[PDB]
Design an enzyme around this catalytic site. Sequence first.
Site, mmCIF file in Angstrom:
data_model
loop_
_atom_site.group_PDB
_atom_site.id
_atom_site.type_symbol
_atom_site.label_atom_id
_atom_site.label_comp_id
_atom_site.label_asym_id
_atom_site.label_seq_id
_atom_site.Cartn_x
_atom_site.Cartn_y
_atom_site.Cartn_z
ATOM 1 N N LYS A 190 0.865 -1.174 0.000
ATOM 2 C CA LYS A 190 0.000 0.000 0.000
ATOM 3 C C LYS A 190 0.898 1.219 0.000
ATOM 4 O O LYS A 190 1.349 1.656 1.063
ATOM 5 C CB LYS A 190 -0.897 -0.057 1.214
ATOM 6 C CG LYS A 190 -1.939 1.052 1.236
ATOM 7 C CD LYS A 190 -1.561 2.115 2.256
ATOM 8 C CE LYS A 190 -2.278 3.421 2.044
ATOM 9 N NZ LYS A 190 -1.438 4.511 1.464
ATOM 10 N N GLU A 211 8.989 0.746 11.547
ATOM 11 C CA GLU A 211 10.083 1.731 11.533
ATOM 12 C C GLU A 211 9.422 3.087 11.594
ATOM 13 O O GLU A 211 8.755 3.491 10.650
ATOM 14 C CB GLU A 211 10.929 1.656 10.256
ATOM 15 C CG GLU A 211 12.273 0.961 10.434
ATOM 16 C CD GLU A 211 12.144 -0.539 10.524
ATOM 17 O OE1 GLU A 211 11.001 -1.041 10.310
ATOM 18 O OE2 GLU A 211 13.175 -1.234 10.754
ATOM 19 N N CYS A 229 13.497 9.881 8.752
ATOM 20 C CA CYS A 229 13.203 9.475 10.128
ATOM 21 C C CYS A 229 14.463 9.558 11.020
ATOM 22 O O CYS A 229 14.365 9.825 12.220
ATOM 23 C CB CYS A 229 12.549 8.085 10.163
ATOM 24 S SG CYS A 229 11.164 7.867 9.003
ATOM 25 N N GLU A 256 9.279 15.498 16.534
ATOM 26 C CA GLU A 256 9.806 15.304 15.191
ATOM 27 C C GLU A 256 9.198 16.376 14.291
ATOM 28 O O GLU A 256 7.964 16.486 14.180
ATOM 29 C CB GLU A 256 9.483 13.912 14.666
ATOM 30 C CG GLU A 256 10.115 13.606 13.319
ATOM 31 C CD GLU A 256 9.879 12.181 12.888
ATOM 32 O OE1 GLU A 256 8.707 11.764 12.830
ATOM 33 O OE2 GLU A 256 10.864 11.476 12.602
#
Lengths: 494, 494, 494, 494
Positions: free
Chosen positions: D186, D262, D296, D393
Amino acid sequence: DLPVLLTDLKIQYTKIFINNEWHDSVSGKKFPVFNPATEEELCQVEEGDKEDVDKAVKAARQAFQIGSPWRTMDASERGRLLYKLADLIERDRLLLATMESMNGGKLYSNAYLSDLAGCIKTLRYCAGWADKIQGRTIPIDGNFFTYTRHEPIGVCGQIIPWNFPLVMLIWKIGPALSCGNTVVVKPAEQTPLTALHVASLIKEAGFPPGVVNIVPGYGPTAGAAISSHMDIDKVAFTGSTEVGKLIKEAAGKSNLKRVTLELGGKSPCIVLADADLDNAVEFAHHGVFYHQGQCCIAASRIFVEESIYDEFVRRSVERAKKYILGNPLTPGVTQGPQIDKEQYDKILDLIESGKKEGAKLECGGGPWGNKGYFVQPTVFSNVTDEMRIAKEEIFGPVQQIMKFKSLDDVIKRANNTFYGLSAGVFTKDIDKAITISSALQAGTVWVNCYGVVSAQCPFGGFKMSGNGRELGEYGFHEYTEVKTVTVKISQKNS
Amino acid sequence: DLPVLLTDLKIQYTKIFINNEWHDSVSGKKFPVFNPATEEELCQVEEGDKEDVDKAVKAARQAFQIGSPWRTMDASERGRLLYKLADLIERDRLLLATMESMNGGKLYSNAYLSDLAGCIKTLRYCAGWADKIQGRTIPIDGNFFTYTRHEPIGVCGQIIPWNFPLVMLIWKIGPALSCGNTVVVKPAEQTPLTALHVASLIKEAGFPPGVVNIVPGYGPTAGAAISSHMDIDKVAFTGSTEVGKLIKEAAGKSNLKRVTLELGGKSPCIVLADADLDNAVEFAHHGVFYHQGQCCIAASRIFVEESIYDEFVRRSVERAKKYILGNPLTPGVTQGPQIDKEQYDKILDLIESGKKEGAKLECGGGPWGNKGYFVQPTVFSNVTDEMRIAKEEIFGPVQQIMKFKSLDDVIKRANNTFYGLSAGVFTKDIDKAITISSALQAGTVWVNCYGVVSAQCPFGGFKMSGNGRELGEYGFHEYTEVKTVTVKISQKNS
Amino acid sequence: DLPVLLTDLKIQYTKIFINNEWHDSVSGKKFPVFNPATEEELCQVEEGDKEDVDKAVKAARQAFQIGSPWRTMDASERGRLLYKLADLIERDRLLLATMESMNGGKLYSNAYLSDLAGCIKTLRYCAGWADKIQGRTIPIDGNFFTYTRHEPIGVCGQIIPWNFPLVMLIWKIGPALSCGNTVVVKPAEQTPLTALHVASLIKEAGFPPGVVNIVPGYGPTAGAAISSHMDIDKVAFTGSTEVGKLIKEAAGKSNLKRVTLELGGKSPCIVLADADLDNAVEFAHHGVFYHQGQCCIAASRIFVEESIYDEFVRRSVERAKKYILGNPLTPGVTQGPQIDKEQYDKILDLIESGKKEGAKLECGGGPWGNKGYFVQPTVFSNVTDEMRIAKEEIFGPVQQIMKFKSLDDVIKRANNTFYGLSAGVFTKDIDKAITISSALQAGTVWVNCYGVVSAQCPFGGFKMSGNGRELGEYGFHEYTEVKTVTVKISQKNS
Amino acid sequence: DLPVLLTDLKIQYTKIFINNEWHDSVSGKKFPVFNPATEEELCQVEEGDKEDVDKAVKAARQAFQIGSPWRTMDASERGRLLYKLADLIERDRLLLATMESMNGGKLYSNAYLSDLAGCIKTLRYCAGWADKIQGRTIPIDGNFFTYTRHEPIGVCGQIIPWNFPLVMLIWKIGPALSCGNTVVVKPAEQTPLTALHVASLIKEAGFPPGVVNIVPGYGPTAGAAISSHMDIDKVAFTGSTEVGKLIKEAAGKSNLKRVTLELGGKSPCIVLADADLDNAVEFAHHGVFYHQGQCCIAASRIFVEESIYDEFVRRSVERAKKYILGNPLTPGVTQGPQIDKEQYDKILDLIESGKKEGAKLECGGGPWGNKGYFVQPTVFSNVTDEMRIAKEEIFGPVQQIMKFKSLDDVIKRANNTFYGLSAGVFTKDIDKAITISSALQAGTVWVNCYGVVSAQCPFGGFKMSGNGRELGEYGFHEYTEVKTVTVKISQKNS
Ligand SMILES: C[C@@H](Sc1nc2c(cnn2C)c(=O)n1-c1ccccc1)c1ccccc1
Ligand SMILES: C[C@@H](Sc1nc2c(cnn2C)c(=O)n1-c1ccccc1)c1ccccc1
Ligand SMILES: [Cl-]
Ligand SMILES: [Cl-]
Ligand SMILES: [Cl-]
Ligand SMILES: [Cl-]
Ligand SMILES: [Yb+3]
Ligand SMILES: [Yb+3]
Ligand SMILES: [Yb+3]
Ligand SMILES: [Yb+3]
Ligand SMILES: [Yb+3]
Ligand SMILES: [Yb+3]
Ligand SMILES: [Yb+3]
Ligand SMILES: [Yb+3]
């Protein structure tokens, strides 16, 4: 704490050990065992020869047969027997350390605190591997089920040196037994005694008969019988590179038995200008002088960058002048004797070559005492690469210190030897630590230390310092034989 | 489909390959290469001797130096070069299969569909390992960081047999190169040609110079130079057990180079009464007769349970009478010639011993044709254990069939040999399959099949059938040298 | 031999164990512990709740800090502590087996000979791994040195079931401690007692404080505090699939803690027509009835080929009618009680569904005795796939036997379940053994046996029977956290 | 060299990919795909929802059935298909890099030279593992033969992020396919296009139908269908920690599917006073600003020792002022746009918090241009630990620089976060390099570098930065399910 044996040592075990029983030699002959500190005879031991090795192999072969107790017992139970043996050696630690010191000329403090601790720890490590030796299942091409068995090899002839009799006995038998082999051990002619005590403990622990057989005797007779034997599957030898060559030849000439060898060295240290100087001096010192220099890893060429060379030599010489020579059983003594006359003569000969070839004698350089094979701790500076003391393994308390100015060149000089057992790198530079250690052609490279040996690490030589590795995960491979089993099936699925 | 080369084969590469360039021999001498089907000379090839091996080693040593392109390139890029080489061999498959058939006396169908497929597949397998070769980090006792490097060994001398020239070339160079070694290859005196074509492809693929060097020539000269060479780190040899012993001796005598050997066999099959009979007959038949019997795994002793023995012999004999002998390039031909006079003479001598010692000749038993080293496919029944045909590797199309009544005894008889390359077990019993395969002293045991070889499996002998394994995960160990690096730190944490 | 405790059992340890000291609950509340054979209260135990779990986690976190004794000690010493703990459990084997039997309703013979033996053996296995947990050195692209550390994860919350309290305690703490984690254990509300005795032995063995903390109490309170805790790094749970789902949800909702689960099953056996019939009957019988059916691997659907189905049912029923019910401490008794009312009620409800849904009751089918949670050993034949007794885990002495005629179909039926813990295949056909076991969607497949569990094997479920594996080499992975360290260097070499 | 596509890009593949054929959505609905540099619609793509995910899972399940081409093909052939796919991506490198740049707002230079190179290299690495995935044979207690199969898990739902669409597609499908799983992918709603081109190449390469299925669409619909699906065996997700929690919850709530995640980070760098300063400045700069900060691993907290702090800030600010913003396809442009409005708004909001909470704005701090989601490259100094820009973040070009004076404290501050993806250590001290990297609670620690990622290394988070590892040897474990097979035998031998 350093405890001691409360009564004097009494030698009990002096016979050949086959099928867990004590045997006279077939000839009936015996040979003397000496204390290298006094030159006095401790006892007589049965002299095994080819006929006794033959009896031992037949016993090992029978213990290895399909359906035997040793082949059929749980791997976990082989492990249990090894841990039990370690418990027994721990129980007899005082006795064994004393015997090791007395027979081997080995400082008692070291024998008790280092040798015996290492012996117990290595056995316990090996015990843990026993039921963790595993093959594979493999996704072969075609409609087949393929697996591998990592089987024991079979009967393993193991020839133990005199410099670390107990430690080396355990380094050999621990992995071999953990993997399910049977063994025929030939301890050094100089130091059979501690091995024979361990044999009594192998019986007490409950190992099946024939799993461990110990034949004391000489190299040219018992060692050459093991090396050329047609029904010994593998030979492991620690000792001189000279004899290693003869073992490898006799294996090829006879039955193509597998061979592993841990042989001598001429191990280098490279001390960069940025090194922690007193740390490098201390480790390099211990690296060469440990156990009267009778270590295959002896740090017998120390290369020091020019700008710190004089200061390194000065500090090294003062460290070397602090020893007390004498009987290795007396507390406070810090240097024992060499093992025997042959080694003693070799060391003094090489010390004389250093003098004659123009090395600078900083201290020592001669014999010591009225009895015992004692050599003064010796330091040479201004050593050059074509000197005998730079090329030949001395195996004595003799330190060589060299200068360098170029890092490219000193690496070449370090690698310019048929040996390659170990090396030392001393620096604060991360990049230098990694790149120099990668470039050195040596099996163990220590960084900012030296002589750090543990059961969890593989250990062995590059080049003529050996074939194969001992201990660690990797060492266990050399005590297995891989069998592939490929089964036809109608249809495989991933 | 079986495609063929559209124009006739032209031999181009006949020279010594060093530093990716073509060299005349130092002496200037050349030697003839023959077709074993016609006994006609195909071409001349430069005769490498000790002087040429010396040039090759210097080139391999230089390519192996710290900082060289081969040492410094990404492991993934060594893998890339190997996969590219496999693509090139695939491109030249027709050419290579034809040359292999013509030079090696090998059926073209097999050369194209099996040998070349196996060569391409093994290279691709090996390519995949290149950046998956890993050391360890180890929780050593004390305040140290310990890791290991699984380094290439260095310069590897590799001596290739004549029976599978291309496959064995790749079995040697694939793992060696994947691990980062440099090689000096010595193809068989009978079959240098396909190796020299592969050398041209190594250049085309972009391997750095000196990484692969190929020196054609003879065993006693070029092979003995490699085995005794002081700067070759490892030797791998496939061939007779006789020469394997001489390799192992010369390694010990010279520089203690590492040795791996894949040698002959006298591999047994055990066919139980409950076996699928036609499956066992077909696999045992192919197991002994493949490539004119010139396989080290040849199933050269077939033990069959008494109750199905007569029927097994009958079915086997009818299968053996269905061959068409001739030139291995002609379609429909199903048996080529033996490789040369020496092997031809050995086979006929052993066939004569079977007759003289009282074996029952079921078919064949003599030579065939007006030219070429052809031997009729031969079957002996009622073979006993002390016959020469039961003890000696024939390496020819000669099948031995024996009866047994006791399973305990037939296992002993199967294991009663200094060989131990492989074995076959045929049964429908799960317990028998597992227990018999465990008890057989052989490196590969096939169950209800035979001669199933794949790149994913380790392969090699027990006992005098070899030292070490090739291919699989396990085979790669023998192309690395383990270095332990132990770094002093202030405090370790788990 | 089956020895017994000579004096009556006295319960000593009933408190919360944190930092190697005994704590009252923060609330001061306590909860009753019962004997399931008598329904009588044995003692009271301190009731840990979220506030006590919080104290335990803080203690575990502190013991896990960089520089702590548990982080800094040699891996070999973590191993030593585990082997010492095994020696202590062995010393207290009679005591522990008696307590386990009394508290858990577990046959004393089994508690002593199986549970305690497995507990000791698993600990010793785990001890052996401690200094064999290793990372890698990796040939990364570019000029870098890359290694990995296989670190402990940190604080591990471990929730232990009531069916094998001691074995499961050790299956959890053994690998976790071997790898260097700290733990917060929450034994079953029904069976806290043996865990608390083991806590006293953890203190005696010399584990640093906070390395093992044990908080007895209930699931919804103490278990839900562990699962939702923000500073617990990992949770391991054995129990019902229902609660496993709630654990996995609470982990995702809170701090994404790692989760491993060993959950229920509806494990199938496939018995082919060619199977050894009495072997299949005996193993399938023990496979379903062991420990009053309270095993997650219970062989609770037995599919038998039509031609041997009637005979299988007959032999199974006669085996099931041979039990003696009673107190699990009395010798000769062969079936104890179920653990408690909730489980007892569930089992009887499911037995009633079997009757109502049209299964054939062969024996049993009701309660037993005047006290204790006893259920008659029950056998149903002619079971179909949509019956409750075919779909739902009963966790009681209730056997289901089904017929099949097609092997394709019975494999589909075997796999047609959200469970997948284990399975059994019974056949003499080699191909069927391999192909059926490959096709079954179950974590452990036994061939011609059932319920064979050992420390050397990984164990766990496919599908909703679990996440992750316990024990074996593979199980240890889930108690490490992998850290990659990549260091810039000037030039790498292979 | 940096080559470019010679004709303009034409979008071809916009449909759902199931069983190697192109499908309209079940609803018939489509959704727009935009260029983030222009805010202009590139095309429409079929909107997959639960009904389309259901079709994909059925196709994946059927391709995974025992006896299917994907289950039965040689492992080596799964590897071959992956290497072929890598060759095809290499063939279409210009096309794919252009599409990736255009759709993803990703600098073309980086898309071509880094992303595409990494995609090709990772696939080739994964291809190599295919026939090297192996179980074990295990020396279990008792008379049993025990082996393990490392089977594929089955159907794996894989949810790919928008920041590295191609690289992350390959990181997911490469290991999953190498291990023999089937997948339902996806891709991100923002970046479906390159995945759909790769789907066309999966067809061309010859993968069996249903092995790879790609369903573009939104997170809350298609992603939530995958996470809650009852016949998906495993889910892998890269993305925000927020959504990771919801994935883990839905897995526990539905079928206990295996989960790997992750997730984000707030990765710290520690720059010691002795660090190579310009190296640390350059790597820390690239560590935070790479791909518009949308990594990330972004080095979003940089701790610098006080004495070099001012100089570090100065050098960092001058490096940050050297960018050219614009369309990522135009050569010389060095900073593209952010991916979309939601991310753009989040970044600007967090920049405003830095200003309001008292951080020192050194440069940037606002939007750029008349179109596209562009944010000026921004640097904050004097950042403190409770500021939003230190805790959250940002996922944008926003650098935070902090001072420290104590090494103990800065390690605590570095570890004082629920994240733990990666970290950087900059020092010349060997001991500090090793001890600091050991103490940091992060999955990858770089020493004297940052953002060095390769296929040979495992990669993933500690704590809430993820569960499990990707790539390396270790990453492959999470795409297998371990089955233990234990076979009763009459007698085992070692
Ligand atoms: C006693 C040690 S071995 C050991 N320790 C040493 C040496 C030099 N200085 N030092 C402190 C040395 O050469 N060996 C040694 C190495 C290989 C073979 C035989 C002996 C040990 C440590 C751990 C386990 C077992 C043995
Ligand atoms: C060509 C095959 S090897 C091969 N295939 C054989 C033999 C006998 N019958 N058959 C069908 C045989 O003796 N070898 C062989 C084994 C070891 C070394 C050299 C050759 C192969 C298969 C897969 C990969 C590479 C090579
Ligand atoms: Cl290693
Ligand atoms: Cl293997
Ligand atoms: Cl496993
Ligand atoms: Cl790893
Ligand atoms: Yb110092
Ligand atoms: Yb004297
Ligand atoms: Yb047949
Ligand atoms: Yb002739
Ligand atoms: Yb039976
Ligand atoms: Yb009642
Ligand atoms: Yb610099
Ligand atoms: Yb705008």
